[PDB]
Amino acid sequence: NSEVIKDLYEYLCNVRVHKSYEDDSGLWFDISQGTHSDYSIMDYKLGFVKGQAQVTEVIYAPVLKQRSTEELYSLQSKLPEYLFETLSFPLSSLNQFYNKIAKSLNK
Amino acid sequence: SEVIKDLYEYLCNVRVHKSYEDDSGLWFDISQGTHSGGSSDDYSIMDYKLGFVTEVIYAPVLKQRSTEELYSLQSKLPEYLFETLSFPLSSLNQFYNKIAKSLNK
């Protein structure tokens, strides 16, 4: 069931959670996101982590090792530079983030 | 499982509540919502089912929505999204996108 559901989410939203896991900092997701532009894909990690005061931060890291040479040149021409950096942002920015990846990959 | 759906909801403002089978086929209960707002901000929700018997069936879920809710939804979404539709599964993301944008009006 859960595999079918993940497949439906990909057909619906062009995003896939490859796996989730918890470590000593928080809850992590390995994700691929794509969009037609011919389909451009970005791999990244999202972590839901809490400091001592229990405020949730979303940690973003690009995962370039999943890309081909040409795809890396393509990304460099499409994505704003901060998407090649580790980022933190509140839960309230997650849909802004999703839309930013989707628009950047479509370029 | 549950946390995965939570992630997709945060990211995409959509939720697959349940999947189940019937004589007709395989079905999914779906809700899509307006993107996060403030305390005073509008929040609209569209409910629909997706069915599989490659073609997907889109069946909007409207009967338990108030008169005022349906009027508001019909002011934002195009008229065809209130009818049952059949289209290629490969086009489904286009309808996710259209619904998401429409709900943000």
């Binding site: 079918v4 497949d7 990909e10 057909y11 062009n14 995003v15 896939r16 490859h18 691929s32 996101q33 794509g34 389909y39 894909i41 090792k65 999943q66 890309r67 081909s68 | 599989f52 490659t54 997907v56 599964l89 490969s90």
Partner: peptide
Amino acid sequence: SNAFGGTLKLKKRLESVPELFLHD
């Protein structure tokens, strides 16, 4: 072929270092 409705491009993943061999 890899999903119920056809082929999902995000489900196919590159193996970045398939020939890795950890040794001394």
